[PDB]
């Protein structure tokens, strides 16, 4: 067969140990999910420094904690805008997930609180910026560089799926690089606890699985499709399906055809054909052997999964970091003031926050 006795025994024992780890991680997650934390700081405990990014109902600012001098990333959400954009359940869900999970590549929530106007989530500051910026600047990542990042996503999805969480918005824009060159996942607005199937149309056009586009009930296999898209974009510099308008992107996704750059290795193409598989009865990550079909594929033959988890592998790239509070890896935005009303807004809708 492909493995001799020593390698087969080592691989078998390794997979059993992963099961044992995940069983303990699920017990710890459920305890924190059932009893979430609330109100662990207040606004005047921090100095505001710079805006790191913004959405349609809030922004993320670099702040410095007054007592400790530590820097953090503070997400500020306007309660009135959250309601008007129908994002109440998503916002409460993101905070409940963040306070319950624990994994080396998931960002850590350190404080949360609220006032009359806004909700606040204070997370560790990840100073290297988005993978997106580095990928567009460098052009594309070599296959070993792409594989280093892909291995961290495989482990992170193995963890999340063991908790029955589907992620649903993987893309380079949602992956930050930390000071040691490892990945941090920060946003969980579209994640959902799903043991069986779910039906919501959500995600980003280039990364949507065919079964979402076709309005089917779907499961955690959409995250393994999105992993195929991410690995392709990292290694090519562009995604496998693109067009002027989303409707034409969707035509390409459901077609079952994908084309590859001539510099892709045969091992990489084989992995991608099995992740970007329209037929769910054939898609890697969705079969009887689960995540092991991915972790044991030839393209990952050089990957030491435990060493990646322990952060003992030397990263191919370390972002420029001149010191604490360095923001050079982030875009520049115009600074707007944080007004706090004299009257509580939307108190009933955000009672559990």
């Amino acid at each position: 067969g492909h493995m001799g006795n020593a390698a087969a025994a080592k691989k078998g024992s390794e997979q059993e140990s992963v099961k044992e780890f995940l069983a303990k991680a699920k017990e710890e997650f459920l305890k924190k999910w059932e009893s979430p934390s609330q109100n662990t700081a207040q606004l005047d405990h921090f100095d505001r420094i710079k805006t790191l990014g913004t959405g349609s109902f809030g922004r993320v600012m670099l702040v410095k904690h007054k007592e400790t001098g530590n820097h953090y990333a503070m997400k500020i959400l306007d309660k009135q805008k959250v309601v008007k954009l129908k994002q109440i359940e998503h916002t409460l869900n993101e905070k409940r997930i963040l306070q319950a999970v624990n994994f080396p590549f998931l960002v850590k929530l350190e404080f949360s609180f609220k006032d009359n106007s806004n909700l606040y989530m204070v997370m560790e500051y990840v100073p290297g910026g988005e993978m997106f910026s580095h990928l567009r600047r460098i052009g594309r990542f070599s296959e070993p560089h792409a594989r280093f990042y892909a291995a961290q996503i495989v482990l992170t999805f193995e963890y999340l799926h063991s908790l029955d969480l589907i992620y649903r918005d993987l893309k380079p824009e949602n992956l930050l690089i930390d000071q040691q060159g490892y990945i941090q996942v920060t946003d969980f607005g579209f994640a959902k606890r799903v043991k069986g199937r779910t039906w919501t149309l959500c995600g980003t056009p280039e990364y949507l699985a065919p079964e979402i586009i076709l309005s089917k009930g779907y499961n955690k296999a959409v995250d393994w499709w999105a992993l195929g898209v991410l690995i392709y974009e990292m290694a090519a510099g562009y995604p496998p399906f693109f067009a002027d308008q989303p409707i034409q992107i969707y035509e390409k996704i459901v077609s079952g055809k994908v084309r590859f750059p001539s510099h892709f290795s045969s091992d990489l193409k084989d992995l991608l054909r099995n992740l970007l598989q329209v037929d769910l009865t054939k898609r890697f990550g969705n079969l009887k052997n689960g995540v092991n079909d991915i972790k044991n594929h030839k393209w990952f033959a050089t990957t030491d999964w435990i060493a990646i988890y322990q952060r003992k592998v030397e990263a191919p790239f370390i972002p420029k970091f001149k010191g604490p509070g360095d923001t050079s890896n982030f875009d520049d935005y115009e600074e707007e003031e944080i007004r706090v009303s004299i009257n509580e807004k939307c108190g009933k809708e955000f009672t559990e926050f």
Partner: peptide, 18 residues
């Protein structure tokens, strides 16, 4: 080239969710 086609799509910047 395929790269040129990607540039022509106008979707080279940060992408929002639907």
């Amino acid at each position: 080239t395929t790269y040129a086609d990607f540039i022509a799509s106008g979707r080279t910047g940060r992408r929002n969710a639907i």
